[PDB]
RNA sequence: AUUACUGGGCGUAAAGCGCAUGCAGGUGGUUUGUUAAGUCAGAUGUGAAAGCCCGGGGCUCAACCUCGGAAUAGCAUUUGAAACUGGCAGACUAGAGUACUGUAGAGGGGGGUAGAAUUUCAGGUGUAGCGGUGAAAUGCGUAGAGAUCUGAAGGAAUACCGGUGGCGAAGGCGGCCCCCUGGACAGAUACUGACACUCAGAUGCGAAAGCGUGGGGAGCAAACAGGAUUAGAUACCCUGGUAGUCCACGCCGUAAACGAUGUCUACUUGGAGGUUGUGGCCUUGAGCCGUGGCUUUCGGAGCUAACGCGUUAAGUAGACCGCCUGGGGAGUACGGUCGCAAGAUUAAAACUCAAAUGAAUUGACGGGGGCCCGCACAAGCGGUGGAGCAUGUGGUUUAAUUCGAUGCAACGCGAAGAACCUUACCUACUCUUGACAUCCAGAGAACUUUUCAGAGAUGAAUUGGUGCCUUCGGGAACUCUGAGACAGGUGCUGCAUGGCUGUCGUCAGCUCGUGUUGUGAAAUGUUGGGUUAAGUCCCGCAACGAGCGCAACCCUUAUCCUUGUUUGCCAGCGAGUAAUGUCGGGAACUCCAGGGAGACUGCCGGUGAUAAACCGGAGGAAGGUGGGGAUGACGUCAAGUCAUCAUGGCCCUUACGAGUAGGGCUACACACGUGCUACAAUGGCGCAUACAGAGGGCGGCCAACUUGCGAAAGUGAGCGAAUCCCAAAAAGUGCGUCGUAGUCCGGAUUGGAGUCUGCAACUCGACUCCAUGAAGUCGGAAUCGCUAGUAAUCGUGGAUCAGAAUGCCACGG
C-alpha cells in the first residue's frame, strides 16, 4: 500500500547510503561489493548499536562509515582489513556517533526487536520507545509491531503513534526502519517511523 | 425479593376481564354519647419433661451429662385504658342522590322522505369499436356496443358540511323530517342525610365474519370460472362471479374489542389549542375578563430499563377488583359448561430448551427517502465478439506436458524473453558428510596439458609446474580423501508468519484527547446553513482542540530572465566543397543545464450572509488544482506470494538431497481471455520527395568498401559517446497504375534453397529468397476503451537477451 519513507525522500530531504559514480560494467560489481560489506559489518556489529553503513568509493578505494551508538565497542583495524579484503581495494573505515540513539528509527526497532526476542510485552517495548523519543524531542513517532504477538496463533498488527508523522509531506524529515524479531512463534516485524520536523529549503 | 406478610409486579418484557350492572364479601365522610368486640396494659391459671438460648456445674479438653434462668410469641379467666376500628343510640352536610330551568350532541329505537350516483331495462340519436393493462388477453359490440338523450324500476349508501368536532359504558353512531326515548352538563334555590366505593360468583350489552328461518339483492365480493404473469402461480393483475354484504327475528360472544393503560377518590409547576355551558363588563365596537364540563398537544418535578408518561400520570397516596410468575408444548389435550353448528369458555401434563423477551446503541442491509460524485450512463468515436495468426488459461492428451496466479481485483499474469542451459518436471544413467557450508585430521601448491572409455556425469592412465611465507615439524591458500557433528530440499503449511503486493480508490474519509450528555452500549466533536475536487473553506453549534488522510512541499511540461558555450548552435561574418557549419570566426539564435521570475481568485465588475465561495472580465506563455506524474488514510477481502527472499512448525535425509544425458514445459477433439493482421480506393502498388522525439551501445553499436536477388558475408573504420554507431522515421506530399474483386485486397499454409546465433536450431529459433496464395467481403446476442494533444492512426527506441517481442515499458508524427 505505502511507499517507503526513505525511498520517496531520496534527493528531497533524505541522503544516500552509497555515493559512487560507476559506469555500467563496474556498477553491478560495486553494488555486490557493498552488499557483502554491509552483510559483514552488520553481522559483526550486532552488539554495537549499528544504524546506517554509508559506503563511498573515493576513486579506487572504499570508505565506510559505521554510524553507531557505540563508537567504543567498534577492532577497527580488523574491520578496515576485512572490508579491504571483500572490496579488494584499500579500505578506510570512519565512525560516527549516533548522539541521541533513541531518536534513530533503526536502533529504536533493533531495541524493540531485542526486547521481543528476550520475551518482553510488545506493548511495553513499543510504548517505552514512543515515550523516550517524544521526550528527546521527536516531533512524532509511530511504531508498528506485526506478527504472532505474545505468540498468538493468529498474527495481528498493533501500532502506537504520538506526535505528527506526516508521511505524504515530502519535506518532512521522517526516519524509517524495519527490524525483525526472530522468535519461537516466527518472525515479528518492527516498522518504526520518526518525524524529526519538516526541512524547509530542500536537501 | 423467582408466589414478594415482612418483600414483586401488569403501556411496550409474563400480566388490566371487551364493556358494564350488581348480590355475598372487602372498604367507607363528619360528629356526640355509650359499649368494650377488635386493640392496649396487668394479674391468675396453663403452655409436660427433653431440646434451643443465657449463666453456671461435672467429665484432662471437647462432644457428652447436668443445675438455675430465659423462652414456649398461645389460650382461658379476670381487672383496668378508651386514642383508633367495630357495635348501639343520636347528630351533621362536604360524599352520593332528588326537585326546578336551560344547553349542546352522528346517544338509542321506530317510521317517513330527498338528492347524487351505479346497475338493469325501454325508446331516440348514432357507428365501430368498447373495455381492460406494464403490455395484453379473457369479455362486450354490427343481432348496433361503447357514447349521448329521455324515461322506468330497483337496491344500497348518504358528496359538500366534516373537524386530533360531537355523542355513547364499551362495541359504536353521519342526508333531511317526525314520533318514542337514555345520558351528560350548567345555573339557581330547596330537599334527603353517608343512602357511598369496589366487586368473587351472577346478569346484561358486545365490531366483523359466521349460523337459523323468512325476505331482499343495485354495487361489491370469500368460493369459483376464464385470461394474463411465472420455472411453477392452487396468488398478486384483468374479465366474470356466488355466499355474504341489506331487512325481520333469533343464535354466536369473539377481535391489535387498543390508550395493548381496571374502577373510584384526593393531592402535586406550566404553555398553546378545540368544544359545550354560565356570570360580569361598556355590546362602550364582532370583544375582554371570570367560572364550570368535556377534549387535543407540548412540556416541569417526579416516575420509568429505556422508550416515554407527565393534573386526561405511567407522579404522590387510599379502597376494591382482575391478572402475571422462563421459552416451546399450549390457550392445546382431557373433563365440565355453553352453542344448531362454527366454536367459545374453564384449563393441564409428559417432554423439551438455556434461553425466550423489552427498550435502546453501533454497524450492515432495504426492490425506503433525500442529496451528491466517477467515461457510471447518456452524447459520440474506435474496438472485442466473427477470420487467420500470436499469446495466456482451461480441458484433454502425455512418461513428463513443472509450480504458482482464478469474479471484479487469474487468464500477453510470476516469466524484463523454456532449443541446451534456464528447469523446479520426465525417462535413463549416476553419488551419498554429499553439488553447496563450517569444523577436524592427514595428504597433495594451485594448475597444466593429452589421452582412452562413456550419452555425459565421472573414472583410470599423461606431461609441464610445484611458487608463497618462514616460528622455518611453520604461515597461507587451493586441490583431494577420511571422520561424524552436520549439509541440502523451488518439499508442506500464505489458515502459524515477516517482508512485499492487489483491491475499494487518490474514494474523502478514519479517529483521538479534553469537556459535555446518557444508568449504559454510546453520543457529541464529524451534525446543521452555504461552499469545495476534497471532513475544502466559511457561518452557525456543548463542544474545544488535535492526529492520519485532502491540499501544499517533489519530478515533468507550458513562458521569461540570468550564468556558460562543446561533442550542440550558425544571425551577422569571410573562405570553401559535388554538397556540406564544411571551416575561420560568432555567442546572436535553436538548444543544453545550473540559478532565478511567473498564477495568488492577486486585480476589476457582478452575486452571496458584509462569509466561504461563485459567475464573468483585464493582464498574461499560462486562470482559478494551468497539463501530466509521483504521493494510496484507518481498514476490507484468514485477498496474493513459504517458488525472490526470510521464517515457526512439519516432513525428507543412500533421498522429497546431489551430478549428468535425452525428452518436456511448444502436446491438441476443443472452449475462453488478451493481442496482432486483414477484409481494401480516406486503399494497394511502383517511383519521386519531406518533417521527429526518445533511447541504447564494448565479448558492444558497427560507418565505408566489395561480394550476394537477399538474409548476410567477407572486410574495415569510428565510438564508452550533444562527437561515432545503431539510424531508415512512418503515416505525409508529388506523379503514375490497379478499377473496385476474393482483386496489383489479404496474408495463412506448405514445398524447396539459404543465412545467422549457438557445442547444438529434429522435437522446438529468428531471418532471407523462390514458389505456394487458405480464412477473411467489416462481424449475433453481448461487450470494452476513451472527454484533448485524449481517442484513432503512424512509425521509433528500450529492458530481458547468445538467438528469439504481435507482449511490456517508453518516444514522438
PDB file of C-alpha atoms (C1' of nucleotides) in Angstrom, chain B residues 392-394 402-406 410 413-415 492 640-644:
ATOM      1  C1'   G B 392      -2.145 -16.914 -21.943  1.00  0.00           C
ATOM      2  C1'   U B 393      -5.723 -20.087 -19.435  1.00  0.00           C
ATOM      3  C1'   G B 394      -8.890 -24.306 -19.076  1.00  0.00           C
ATOM      4  C1'   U B 402       6.982 -28.461 -13.534  1.00  0.00           C
ATOM      5  C1'   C B 403       4.892 -24.926  -9.813  1.00  0.00           C
ATOM      6  C1'   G B 404       2.001 -20.703  -8.857  1.00  0.00           C
ATOM      7  C1'   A B 405      -1.983 -16.738 -10.255  1.00  0.00           C
ATOM      8  C1'   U B 406      -8.899 -17.922 -10.681  1.00  0.00           C
ATOM      9  C1'   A B 410      -6.254 -15.054 -12.506  1.00  0.00           C
ATOM     10  C1'   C B 413      -0.107 -12.733 -15.064  1.00  0.00           C
ATOM     11  C1'   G B 414       5.153 -14.614 -11.622  1.00  0.00           C
ATOM     12  C1'   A B 415       8.285 -15.235 -16.805  1.00  0.00           C
ATOM     13  C1'   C B 492       4.090 -28.854   3.180  1.00  0.00           C
ATOM     14  C1'   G B 640      -1.973 -12.874  -3.397  1.00  0.00           C
ATOM     15  C1'   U B 641       3.042 -14.536  -2.555  1.00  0.00           C
ATOM     16  C1'   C B 642       6.576 -20.311   2.218  1.00  0.00           C
ATOM     17  C1'   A B 643       8.581 -20.681  -5.769  1.00  0.00           C
ATOM     18  C1'   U B 644      12.609 -13.908  -4.821  1.00  0.00           C
TER      19        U B 644
END
